[PDB]
Structure formats: structure tokens, C-alpha cells
């Protein structure tokens, strides 16, 4: 497994999931395939606590599960769940989530600038802050509707995102082969 894939997964798990998730994933990075029981004993988590962490990582498609069903020494049927990181699905979910996050931010920025800050009490025309200043009437000293001339009434995250997410973009690019 390429070092850059490992690092991508380690970065993303730390940034967007809890400590518990990071520590569970560390085991799956150390070893290709691991029994849930072995993970349980290593981490000292409660049983439901671990299962919930694994359920979350499986839902976000970071890890997959393969059951092994065998006859045990005492003759009973045994069901082991072996977990592993699925790097092709992990990289895709990461791209999917980052693309939608960006787009949600972009949409919020568009909405905020197109926000109807001013509204005519008569004809109900609305105006954005940019539109509003060219509504000012120096002869009355007030903002007046462009249509009926009635006095109008009242009523960056992307840059941060781009700063904070660049390490992941870089690791994504590094893995593109």
C-alpha cells in the first residue's frame, strides 16, 4: 500500500472523525485484515462502543467487512468479522464529500450576496445591498423603490475552507496514479 494512500486516510480520519475512529483505523493501517475481536482486545473499547465506530466507518465506506464462518474446536459454528481499509472506495467518498462541501459553501455565498436586503412595502419588489445604494434619493435623503418610488424597508467561509482543506487536496493529487 502506497504511503500517500495511508497518509490520506490518516489525515482524513483525524480531521473529520473522533479519536476512537483514528485509533481503530491505525490498526487497519498496521495490518491488512483484522478480526473485530482482536481490534476489541487491542483498543480496550466496550463492545458496543467499538461496533458503533466500525459501523460508522463502514457506512462512510472507509472500511469493509468479510465474514469467516468455520467450525470451532468445540464443534460449534464460529462467525468472525475481518475488517480492512478499502482504499478505492475511501478516496471516492472523500472526493464526493469535499466536492459537496465546497458547493454548499459556494451556494451559501451566492445566497448571502443575492439576499433580499430591502423590500418595497407597496409593490413587494426586493433589492440586494448592491442594488440598494442606487436607490438612494439625495433630494429626500432616503432609499426609494426603482419602480413605484415608495420608501423601501430593511428585511469568508470559502477562504477558510480552502486554507484548511489544501493538505487533503494535495494528498489526493499525490495518489492520482
Amino acid at each position: 500500500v502506497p504511503a500517500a494512500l495511508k497518509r490520506l486516510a490518516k489525515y482524513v480520519i483525524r480531521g473529520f472523525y473522533g479519536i476512537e475512529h483514528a485509533l481503530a483505523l491505525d490498526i487497519l493501517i498496521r495490518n491488512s485484515c483484522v478480526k473485530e475481536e482482536d481490534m476489541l482486545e487491542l483498543l480496550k473499547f466496550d463492545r458496543k462502543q467499538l461496533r458503533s465506530v466500525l459501523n460508522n466507518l463502514k457506512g462512510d465506506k472507509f472500511i469493509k467487512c468479510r465474514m469467516r464462518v468455520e467450525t470451532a474446536a468445540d464443534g460449534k459454528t464460529t462467525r468472525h468479522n475481518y475488517y480492512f481499509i478499502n482504499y478505492r472506495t475511501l478516496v471516492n467518498v472523500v472526493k464526493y464529500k469535499l466536492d459537496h462541501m465546497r458547493r454548499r459553501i459556494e451556494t451559501d455565498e451566492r445566497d448571502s450576496t443575492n439576499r433580499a436586503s430591502f423590500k418595497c412595502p407597496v409593490c413587494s419588489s426586493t433589492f440586494t445591498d448592491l442594488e440598494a445604494n442606487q436607490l438612494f434619493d439625495p433630494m429626500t435623503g432616503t432609499f426609494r423603490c426603482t419602480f413605484c418610488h415608495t420608501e423601501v424597508e430593511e428585511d469568508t467561509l470559502l477562504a477558510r475552507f480552502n486554507e484548511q482543506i489544501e493538505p487533503i487536496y494535495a494528498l489526493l493529487r499525490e495518489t492520482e496514479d
Binding site: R7, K10, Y11, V12, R14, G15, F16, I19, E20, L23, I27, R30, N31, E41, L42, L43, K44, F45, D46, K48, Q49, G59, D60, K61, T89, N92, V93, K95, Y96, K97, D99, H100, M101, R104, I105, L157, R160, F161, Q164, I165, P167, I168
Partner: protein
């Protein structure tokens, strides 16, 4: 249960566990081994990672700071708000191609 003389011995034990894949160490086992363990544990600061179990017992892990990455919680909540658990993997790939990625 553990031989932990001092702060330095505590750090080396946690380090070795990390390096050797030996797993988490319950805080209470450390408290038994190391007098005034609260001093040593506090002194070591963020070199230790703590997990809380449901019974409120604490588990200790070496903090490897090689991979360190973090974002504003608004971005954490935003990440969570993009659902993928209900989605076919194929559907995810379709989206990526639709958008040119």
C-alpha cells in the same frame, strides 16, 4: 501489572505500545503502578490520547503527532451533513464523473 517508575517510564511504555501494536492501557493500571500518577500524566500533556469508555474508565494511547490534521467544527459538521451511507458506490462514481472528477 505494569512497571512504571516515573513520567519518562510512562511515556516510553506508551511509545512502545504504539510501536509494537500492543494496544491501549487503562488509566487505572497506571494509577496502581505510579504514585501521584496525576502529576506525570498532566506533565506529558498532549503526548497522550485519552478514550472514555461507557463505564467512564479511561484508556491511554501514545499520541503520534506525525499525522496531525484538523479543521473548524463547522467543516466537521458540514462533512457529516453529506450523506453517503445510503448510497450505492456506483452512484458516487457517477457523481464524480458528472462533475468532471
Amino acid at each position: 501489572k505494569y512497571n512504571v517508575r516515573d513520567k519518562k517510564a510512562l511515556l516510553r511504555l506508551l511509545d512502545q505500545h504504539d510501536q509494537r501494536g500492543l494496544g491501549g492501557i487503562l488509566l487505572e493500571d497506571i494509577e496502581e503502578a505510579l504514585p501521584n500518577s496525576q502529576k506525570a500524566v498532566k506533565a506529558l500533556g498532549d503526548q497522550i490520547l485519552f478514550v472514555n469508555r461507557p463505564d467512564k474508565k479511561k484508556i491511554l494511547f501514545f499520541n503520534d503527532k506525525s499525522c496531525q490534521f484538523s479543521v473548524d467544527e463547522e467543516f466537521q459538521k458540514l462533512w457529516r451533513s453529506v450523506t453517503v451511507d445510503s448510497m450505492d458506490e456506483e452512484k458516487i462514481e457517477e457523481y464524480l464523473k458528472r462533475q468532471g472528477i
